[PDB]
Amino acid sequence: GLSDGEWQQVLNVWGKVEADIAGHGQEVLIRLFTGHPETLEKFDKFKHLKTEAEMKASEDLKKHGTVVLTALGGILKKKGHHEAELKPLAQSHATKHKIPIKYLEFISDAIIHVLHSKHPGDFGADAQGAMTKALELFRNDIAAKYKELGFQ
Numbered sequence: 001g002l003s004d005g006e007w008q009q010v011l012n013v014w015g016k017v018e019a020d021i022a023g024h025g026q027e028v029l030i031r032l033f034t035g036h037p038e039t040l041e042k043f044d045k046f047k048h049l050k051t052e053a054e055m056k057a058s059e060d061l062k063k064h065g066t067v068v069l070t071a072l073g074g075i076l077k078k079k080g081h082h083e084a085e086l087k088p089l090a091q092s093h094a095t096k097h098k099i100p101i102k103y104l105e106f107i108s109d110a111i112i113h114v115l116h117s118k119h120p121g122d123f124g125a126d127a128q129g130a131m132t133k134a135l136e137l138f139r140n141d142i143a144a145k146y147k148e149l150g151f152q
């Protein structure tokens with residue numbers, strides 16, 4: 001449950017991401033994969049990436065980063081009214097990709113890390129609070145769908 005002012009902060013922060021969705025998406029995934037190498041194993045199409053240099057050079061990783069952040073941005077712009085947008089992602093990530101909710105926590109924190117890394121001094125405490133709450137809401141609603149599906 002975010003207030004109007006918190007959603008305003010989220011969407012203000014998101015404008016930073018939308019200015020360079022592929023660069024943000026790439027760095028989010030690289031942060032996830034390097035911070036939590038087990039997550040790489042969930043991607044048949046990225047498990048060949050042995051080094052961060054290879055990840056950085058991967059155009060397909062940037063492409064997927066764009067897909068991920070485009071989806072997330074579409075969800076965030078719903079300001080919590082995202083049941084229709086979230087449902088297929090929860091279902092695909094539970095049933096097809098088999099992504100534990102822990103990895104969604106990892107990527108949530110990776111987003112925060114990337115925002116500070118790319119916008120040092122420009123991702124204020126209020127913005128971090130609001131973005132964190134929005135990612136928690138996202139993760140929590142996914143978690144509810146995971147529970148429905150019995151997925152761990």
Ligand code: HEM
Nearest residue numbers: 039042043045067068071072088089092097099103104107
């Ligand atoms: C912000 C969180 C995330 C969003 C918005 C997101 C979004 C997406 C989207 C839109 C797709 C393609 C459509 C689909 O299959 O449903 C996708 C595919 C996938 N996602 Fe995610 N995802 C997220 C987090 C994760 C995490 C944390 C993992 C694994 C650690 C993961 C693993 C995958 C895999 C394995 C695929 C299929 C990739 C392929 O083979 O093309 N996702 N994701």
